[PDB]
């Protein structure tokens, strides 16, 4: 099977900004009839995905002038000459030329803006954990960019690493900022025994790790 | 890329009592329809679309064209051309680690270039006899064919070698430092020299058979690019 | 024209699945099928095609074997089976209409869920969260609500009627174990927090259960 | 029946009958008149057409007249050559069974205005004429309807399968044993002795035998790609071993040429070859005293060339034996 | 390049009652086919008027002439370059020594591959007896040396086996094939003494064929080098 490579992964442009895209090929997917079968799906978050370019440049009936396309046997690109908010989304290439037909490997389309600190919070468990039988540690942190983030569960001077949960929002459209929640699920055997727990997490607007920790012991 | 070739066969439609100006064709849909399609079994139906066209020049002309693209299942070939003609081939090379004593090294080269010749005549039987490309299976053949020929002028030159006594032939000193002292360290042979002229020729042929052996397997070898590029 | 796709699908593991793909308003067995996984994490992966008119049939390497494609003519449906079902064949599959060479991949299934899990339908069990009394009070802070226990997909976490929709950051759901997960939180005026009453509604339609906890100052 | 082009050509007499109300009388009024002969194509008929048609003719084309009876019967029994297709399995060629269908049904009326009946559920066969090919092991037509995309209505149609077993003695005779013949003499490649100077001609004549005998098959089966005959399978695999017989002959011969001279025996070599496979083998050597260490050397190396002959020998026999019986018996054996 | 005619005409109306026009001279290729073996170099139409014998009157015709091209590749392929490798090795039995036993084999596989290849070509040309082709010239002529080769093949490997126990060396033999010709042809006998009669001339008989086989290798060499170029030249350099 034809491999087909996209870079970069991700390629946060901001609006009105020129915006390229590269596909090749692990062969020449040239054809016998003078064309070479080269086609770009854009999807949207929770959606299908939707035609864009095939046979390299020919444009789909229906979708702006200002993408187009370009390559030669192995190497293929995309060019979007404005970019705008409904432009936000996932590229693919997919190859039509040689039997099985393969898609590319996807490349994330974000749009780069003023980075802001990330304002972090930490919620210890409530009554219906003590009650049903549990301990529920979550962290948060809210409004920030870019994906330069990094979060760590320090605790009373011990760093935890099991039992931590990476779960992080994508880019909105209101704020263009991600979040990061990560969670560390404890036991009421466990849960009144340590003392101390802290959150570090280290982003690139602030070198130092930032902590936030809360005494058990109290 | 016979066998494993991919045909695109058009049906061209017209009217031919009206012209443009008296009937005009419309396509009821984009492809044709296969409801009550039985499968072929030889061939495997790719994509029949159907196009309207007009002749921007004329403006009397109209026709509907389908394209029939079908694609061939290749197993029947490859099993009864194919392997047949690659276990030809690979007896092309054998003729050079014969030894000259057995008097065989004709038999089996002729009988290589007879093989080779017939399947080359058969797949010209199986093929249209255009003159536009060549398969890439009848180009590889034409070149073994080739290389079979070089080697039967070889082998008749290293048998006319073997034979040699010095009654009949004397060695210039220059084959002797060539042929038994520096070409046979290239090729990893080391003359046992235990110890008796006509043994010498004996060698001197062997160490050309053992030359054109390495010729004939680092080409063999490489005819994979004429032969790997097809499938 | 239009591909109708199966409902979502939940399957123990090891068992066999078969979705199916409904094409309507055009010549159904003229134009091949293609099916298209997407694990939930990133990346559109061609398991193969059938050409309905036909028996044609094709699989790239890593699905030869897991699946199965069925066409029925008279009743203009594509059905792909899958086998031995574990937990990575989880995951969302498109179906889309494509005629090689000539037309793309210009109209895609609505897409089909298929999720493999040992767990049954469970209800969810919210634990509403609030900062905690060891943090210095300001002029913002952030809420907290928790959801967890609950299986399958999807559940929907909101405040009371919309009461306070923008700013609210919820996150994609987790598995601890072998149950789904979720958290959500926003930002709110300081001196509207306590006056003004917020709350985290949820809904698991799966398990028809519609839960209101409104969460109070600590 | 052309295996290669995948038809079935028959001549058959297609009898139909129907009723007609417009084509009724009274005998008494015309002298007892019963029924009459006309031409068919002055009355109306049905659109009977072959489906499946391959190089020939959908509809009737000789018309012959048309018996009509007072009643309003009419009975039509034109005859016909019909080319249609068959998909061709040849698996067990020349003992194959084929399955050739032939499908009829009017063309332009559905079920709701012409309705056929079977009039019996067998093909006639009262005036077959004996092929001495083939035999009808049974010729029955089943009764279906079904709809097309074409039309909104159910159009039946009539398909009868025609399953014909293949009387094998001639091709038996002129493929099989010649094959079976050629095959026999596979390994005796390895029996002959180095000196005899002939080991390539036997093993290059079986080996083009077989090609010639596979290229005059694959004349006769059709060109698909969905099944693959036993005897293909048997003559590629005979070529395949054959193929690595010559190989292995040539490094034999180059094995039984050597001398001192030229090359030097290595201590395994001699060990292996000339203590422990020849007993296992149960070829004893003749524990023999020569003095002449360049004679000598060279009846080493001329019987290291007769053991690995033996090892070859055993083992082409066993694979012989094991492939032949591992892929005939299984089939013939149900 | 083929010219074949088409002749048009009315078959039952004069000149003096239906007349040919010559609508356009060339035939109208707009609509062509390309076939892929054949290439249409000129198609004109000439219009002609001539009597019969049948009748009285002068009867008017348009006749078009397709001069058509042959495209070589595929002939090209399949029989010129096999037949080119097999003449290749029409000499070569002339420099197989004697004791390999197998002069025989390769000139008679030589021969039969070269009439069947004559075979094969009969199968495509017509029959006719007023042109006969080059390639066919060309192959009988190889045929007729290759058979020559065969019987002076015979006579050297009778004369190489030849002893003192069968048969005696006239002196005109022994001066002739072993001081004249050898030294003519830079081939040069070592000069060792044996002492052996028997195995002393034995060895002169084994030289005396050789050289008798090395003059038709020079012999054969000239002729068909001459032969092809003076065969195939001409025609080339029209
Ligand atoms: C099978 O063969 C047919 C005929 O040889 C091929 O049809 C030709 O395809 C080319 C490529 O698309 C067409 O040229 C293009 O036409 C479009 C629209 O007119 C134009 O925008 C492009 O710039 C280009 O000129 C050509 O018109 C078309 N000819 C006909 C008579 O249909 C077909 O592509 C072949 N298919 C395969 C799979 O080999
Ligand atoms: C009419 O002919 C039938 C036979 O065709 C015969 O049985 C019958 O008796 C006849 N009737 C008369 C009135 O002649
Ligand atoms: C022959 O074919 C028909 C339809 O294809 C099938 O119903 C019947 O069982 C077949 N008979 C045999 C003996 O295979
Ligand atoms: C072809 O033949 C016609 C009639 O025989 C003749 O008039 C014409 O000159 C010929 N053309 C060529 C190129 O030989
Ligand atoms: C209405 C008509 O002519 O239908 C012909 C095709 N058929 C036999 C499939 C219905
Ligand atoms: C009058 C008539 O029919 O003549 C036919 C002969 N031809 C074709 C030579 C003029
Ligand atoms: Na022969």
Redesign the interface.
């Known amino acids: 099977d034809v491999l087909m490579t996209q870079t970069p992964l991700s390629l946060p442009v901001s609006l009105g900004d020129q915006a390229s895209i590269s596909c090749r090929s692990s062969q020449s997917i040239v054809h016998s009839n003078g064309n070479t079968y080269l086609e770009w799906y854009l999807q949207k978050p929770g959606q299908s995905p939707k035609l864009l370019i095939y046979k390299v440049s020919n444009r789909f009936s229906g979708v702006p002038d200002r993408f187009s396309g370009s390559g030669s046997g192995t190497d293929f690109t995309l060019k979007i000459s404005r970019v705008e908010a409904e432009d936000l989304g996932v590229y693919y290439c997919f190859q039509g030329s040689h039997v099985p037909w393969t898609f590319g490997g996807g490349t994330k389309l974000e749009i780069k803006r003023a980075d802001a600190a990330p304002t972090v919070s930490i919620f210890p468990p409530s009554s219906e954990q003590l009650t049903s039988g549990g301990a529920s540690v979550v962290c948060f942190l809210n409004n920030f960019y870019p994906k330069d983030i990094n979060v760590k569960w320090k605790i009373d001077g011990s760093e935890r690493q099991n039992g931590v949960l990476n779960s992080w929002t994508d880019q909105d459209s209101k704020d263009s900022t991600y979040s990061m929640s990560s969670t560390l699920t404890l036991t009421k055997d466990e849960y009144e025994r340590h003392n101390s727990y802290t959150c570090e997490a280290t982003h690139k607007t602030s070198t130092s790790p930032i902590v936030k920790s809360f005494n058990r012991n109290e | 890329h016979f066998p494993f070739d991919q045909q695109n066969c058009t049906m061209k439609f017209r009217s031919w009592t009206y012209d443009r100006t008296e009937i005009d064709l419309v396509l009821k849909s984009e492809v044709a329809s296969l409801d009550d399609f039985t499968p072929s079994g030889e061939w495997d139906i790719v994509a029949l679309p159907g196009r309207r066209n007009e002749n921007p020049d004329d403006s009397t002309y109209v026709d509907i064209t389908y394209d029939f693209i079908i694609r061939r299942k290749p197993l029947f070939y490859t099993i009864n051309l194919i392997i047949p003609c690659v276990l030809i081939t690979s007896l092309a090379i054998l003729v050079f680690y014969l030894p000259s004593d057995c008097g065989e090294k004709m038999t089996l080269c002729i009988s290589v270039l007879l093989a080779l010749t017939v399947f080359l005549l058969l797949i010209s039987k199986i093929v249209p006899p255009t003159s536009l490309d060549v398969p890439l299976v009848g180009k590889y053949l034409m070149f073994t064919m080739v290389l079979v020929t070089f080697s039967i002028v070889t082998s008749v030159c290293v048998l006319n070698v073997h034979h040699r006594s010095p009654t009949t032939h004397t060695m210039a000193p220059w084959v002797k430092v060539v042929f038994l002292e520096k070409l046979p360290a290239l090729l990893f042979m080391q003359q046992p020299r235990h110890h008796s002229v006509s043994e010498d020729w004996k060698y001197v042929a062997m160490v050309i058979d053992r030359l054109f052996l390495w010729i004939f397997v680092f080409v063999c070898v490489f005819g994979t690019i004429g032969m790997f590029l097809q499938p | 024209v239009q591909l109708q796709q199966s409902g979502a699908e939940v399957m123990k593991p090891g068992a066999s699945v078969k979705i199916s793909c409904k094409g309507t308003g055009?010549?159904f067995?003229?134009?091949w099928i293609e099916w298209?996984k997407q694990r939930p994490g990133?990346?559109?992966?061609?398991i193969?095609?059938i050409?309905?008119?036909?028996?044609?049939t094709?699989?790239?390497?890593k699905f030869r074997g897991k699946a199965t494609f069925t066409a029925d003519?008279?009743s203009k449906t594509a059905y792909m089976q899958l086998s031995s079902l574990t937990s990575e064949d989880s995951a969302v599959y498109?179906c889309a209409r494509y005629?090689?060479?000539?037309?793309?991949?210009?109209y895609?299934?609505?897409?089909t869920s298929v999720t493999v899990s040992s767990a049954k339908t469970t209800p969810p069990?919210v634990?509403?969260?609030?900062?905690?009394s060891?943090?210095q009070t300001n002029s913002?802070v952030?809420l907290?609500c928790?959801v967890?226990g609950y299986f399958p997909e999807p559940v929907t976490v909101t405040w009371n009627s919309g009461s306070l929709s923008?700013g609210v950051?919820?996150?994609?759901a987790?598995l601890?174990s072998d149950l789904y997960?979720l958290?959500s939180?926003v930002?709110v005026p300081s001196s509207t927090w306590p006056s003004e009453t917020v709350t985290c509604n949820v809904a698991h339609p799966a398990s028809s259960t519609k839960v209101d906890k409104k969460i109070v100052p600590r | 029946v052309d295996e290669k082009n995948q038809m079935m050509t028959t001549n058959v007499w297609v009898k139909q009958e129907w009723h007609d109300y417009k084509l009724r009388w009274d005998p008494a009024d015309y002298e007892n008149v019963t029924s009459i002969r006309i031409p068919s194509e002055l009355i109306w008929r049905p659109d009977i057409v072959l489906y499946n048609n391959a190089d020939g003719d959908f509809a009737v084309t000789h018309l012959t007249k048309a018996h009509l009876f007072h009643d309003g019967r009419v009975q039509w029994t034109p005859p016909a050559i019909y080319k249609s297709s068959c998909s061709i399995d040849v698996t067990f060629f020349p003992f194959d069974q084929q399955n050739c269908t032939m499908k009829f049904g009017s063309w332009t009326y559905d079920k709701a205005k012409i309705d056929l009946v079977n009039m019996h559920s067998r093909v006639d066969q009262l005036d077959f004429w004996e092929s001495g090919e083939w035999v009808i092991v049974d010729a029955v037509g089943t009764y279906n309807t079904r709809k097309y995309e074409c039309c909104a209505e159910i159009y039946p149609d009539i398909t009868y399968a025609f399953v014909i077993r293949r009387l094998p003695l001639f091709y038996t005779i002129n493929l099989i044993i010649p094959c079976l013949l050629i095959s026999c003499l596979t390994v005796l490649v390895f029996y002959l002795p180095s000196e005899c100077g002939e080991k390539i001609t036997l093993c290059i004549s079986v080996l083009l035998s077989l090609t010639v005998f596979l290229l005059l098959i694959t004349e006769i089966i059709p060109s698909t790609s969905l099944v693959i005959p036993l005897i293909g399978e048997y003559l590629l695999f005979t070529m395949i071993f054959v193929t690595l017989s010559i190989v292995i002959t040539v490094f034999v011969l180059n094995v039984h040429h050597r001398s001192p001279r030229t090359h030097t025996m290595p201590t395994w070599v001699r060990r292996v070859f000339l203590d422990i496979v020849p007993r296992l083998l149960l070829m004893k050597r003749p524990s023999v005293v020569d003095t002449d260490f360049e004679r000598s050397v060279k009846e080493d190396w001329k019987y290291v060339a007769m053991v690995i002959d033996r090892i070859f020998l055993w083992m082409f026999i066993i694979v012989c034996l094991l492939g032949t019986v591992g892929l005939f018996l299984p089939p013939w054996l149900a």
């Open positions: 055009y010549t067995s003229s134009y298209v990133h990346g559109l992966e061609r193969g095609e050409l309905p008119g036909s028996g044609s094709n699989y790239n390497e003519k008279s498109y005629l090689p060479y000539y037309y793309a991949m210009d895609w299934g609505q897409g069990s634990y509403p969260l609030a900062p905690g060891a943090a913002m952030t907290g928790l967890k923008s950051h919820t996150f994609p987790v601890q997960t958290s939180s930002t």
